Amino acid sequence: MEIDELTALGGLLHDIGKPVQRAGLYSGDHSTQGARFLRDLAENTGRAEYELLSLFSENDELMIRRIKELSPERFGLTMEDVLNALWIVYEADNLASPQASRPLYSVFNPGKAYPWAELDFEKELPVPGDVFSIRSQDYRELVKRLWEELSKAKLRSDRLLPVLEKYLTFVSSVTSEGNIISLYDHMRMTSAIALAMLRAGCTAEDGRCRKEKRFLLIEGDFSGIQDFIYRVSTLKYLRARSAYLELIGWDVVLEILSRLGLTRANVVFNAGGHFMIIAQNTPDAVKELEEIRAKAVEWLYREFESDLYLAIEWEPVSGREFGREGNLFAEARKRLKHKLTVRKLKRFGEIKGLFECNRLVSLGPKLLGFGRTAKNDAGVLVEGPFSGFVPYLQGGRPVGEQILVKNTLNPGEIPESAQFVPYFVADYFKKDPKGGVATFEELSMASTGTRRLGVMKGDVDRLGEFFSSMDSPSKLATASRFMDYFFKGYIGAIIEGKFGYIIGDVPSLRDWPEEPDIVVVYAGGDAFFIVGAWDQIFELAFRVRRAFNAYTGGKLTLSVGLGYFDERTPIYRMADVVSERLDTAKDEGRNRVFVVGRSRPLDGKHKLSYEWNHYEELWRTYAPRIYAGNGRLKGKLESKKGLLWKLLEIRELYVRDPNDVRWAYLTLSDLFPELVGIDTKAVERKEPQPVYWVDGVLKIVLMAVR
């Protein structure tokens, strides 16, 4: 072992006492009980390193003697070193910062709490419901699986994080009321902060690291992503562009960790082109950041000629600022944000000489991950600023100092020396008759009624605020991950048709298929871009928004723009139009979907957008009376398909002038009793007539019947 690996593993295992206390066992307090778990484990298999790492959960009299008994020379460590490793990790626990059965209360809604289960994308949607005690059995089952994994684990932080993430993700780090922080997140943010303090060179400090700017907050944000992906020259290709952006971002992050000698625990978050890292504030570091930032931008400039820029900034921050005094952390993030905004108005300033497509076709099914190697290496299919990426297939061998493995937390059969970097991505796609991904043409052909491609852009409303209200690194970590994982993790499931009970009864035109005609372009961070058969995409929007309502405490809200285009429309226009429709739903207040393009009066009283609940209710009311399902109108309206069309031309003589009462004059008459009468509360509330809203249902029905 070495001092750096120890301190990382030291912060990462400090609070592994908590789950063993909760399951019973050593009958001690979590501190003492954690020591007895690792010491007992160490003796089993016979890996003494754990007995060294057991000292973390516990006048320095006994401590020095207990350390001395354990040979520090055996692991090539100094006695004086290990005292630092303990004190450092001790303070690290305080900076990232009571019955036993208390569960993890949602970051999205502290009122509701998560029922114990291990992180599994396949095994159901995390829905924060009613507060239930977790049994002293569920924890016993946890600790035994946990013990079994740690036995076979290789004892590097990259092989320890994935098993801590599997099992301790849905566990309250402290068992108090309305505790929001996942244990995994507190553990990695103590490993993160601890290692920083070591690399910062501060030692025997009981506040030189605490009340001094010995840390760096490193936030990295790509800009012009929309142009890089959706504005060039096919779906196969446009998918690979989104995948290339993921690898490029990783190539930068991993490089930053590599050159600052930090671990993946130091990656506070990395979602949707936005990443944050905590690090040391050594002159050696800021130099290595200035070197990296430059060599990245130069490469991004050479490669894409200003379409894609990477804005990296860092701020000197102290232990004080990771916590609250009377919320410093948010205010340290704000001063870093402002730094970034400024840098984005200086795109490619890191180039003084500024003022003087076959590899993505062969990259656009069968692979498990990618090998981060040198550029000059055989088999390298794509290259980022710092490293080539060698595709890693099922039957093949992984190649490179780091291996990126897709949609698992289990290394699998990879070499013991290789660093395990897990990455999740939403990449659901309707398979063709051929093994390849469906085309805009194949998708549009599949749709009920009209043959149009369906496009939906979807963002989360006022995320900036939600994240700004996080006290501590560990909180922000639990916030980011749970957010990212909804889109990266569960959108796949949602498309498959899972969680019917959670999201039942949403507007739909056909029965939901086994192999839906959908292709995810992106699904990560707080946003998603998905295309498919227009009627299936229309329904998915309501499914996704319902799942997200449940996945949050009904406390966060989506806005969605929908689009139904001729298959032969260019990618760039469809994007521009759904984009225009999305930020229109947000502008018209938030928590609302743009369902279909609409004529309206330009009197500043009439919103193109519908509130999710408004539309969901409108559909429940009208659709069952007129629509039978799977492309077929109601038998009553066969030979009357026009009575619908006549209401559209009726609503138009309300759009012409919403003060003209002619639409009363014009109005079986039993069908649609809501519209015929002149609404009055709407005239007082300064709101539209029911007539204004209906088209949103009818137009969609008429598209499904043609």
Binding site: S306, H338, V342, L345, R347, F348, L354, F355, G464, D587
Partner: protein
Amino acid sequence: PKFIAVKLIPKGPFRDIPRADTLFGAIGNAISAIHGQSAVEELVDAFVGGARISSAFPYSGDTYYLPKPLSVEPALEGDEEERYTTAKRLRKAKYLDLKNFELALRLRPFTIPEEIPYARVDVPRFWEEIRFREKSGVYFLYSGPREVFDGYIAPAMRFLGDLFEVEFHEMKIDAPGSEYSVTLSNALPTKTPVLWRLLRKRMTFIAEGSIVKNDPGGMERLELGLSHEVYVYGLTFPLGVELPEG
């Protein structure tokens, strides 16, 4: 300072809002057709001499719009929900009315134009045009000697008229005396600028609204092989701008 605003009244739609390089281009080609290359040389000299034209901007009746100076983008912070929402909308806005432009230059509070006098239609088959609102067109500023306006800019603009028709009025922009200035024209910078948006055309231009500190921009003449050495306009149209510290 006061300037000559060349107002373009459109006879139907416009392909684009022309920016300074393509305005000078159009005027350059117009002069060569009227007075030969000798006049083009006297025009480049006048411009190198200190004369400047802005990029084109929208006007609506008696309202002159100008580009949002990037100076404010950082300073926007200087109700949470209102703050986030307002900031984004101000960030998105590409133009400010003269009244409000003169404020933004001094880092005082200002408001956005609610409706902008044009809308990019895109007729498919596809390509798009620009539909101009009633009594709404495009204009651009000229600073320099009158004998250069009368001799070259004016005649050229009439010649280019024959899709639009031309009239020009005197215009005043109160602008704070400062070390820093906004460009009202896309520019090929000499020095590295303060704040900017890049613009790709191949050439690398700083966009309008971008902030420079004592940078006149430069012109470029290149041998395409078209038989006459063509000049690309990249001069800065500077108005002094107060900056926030950071």
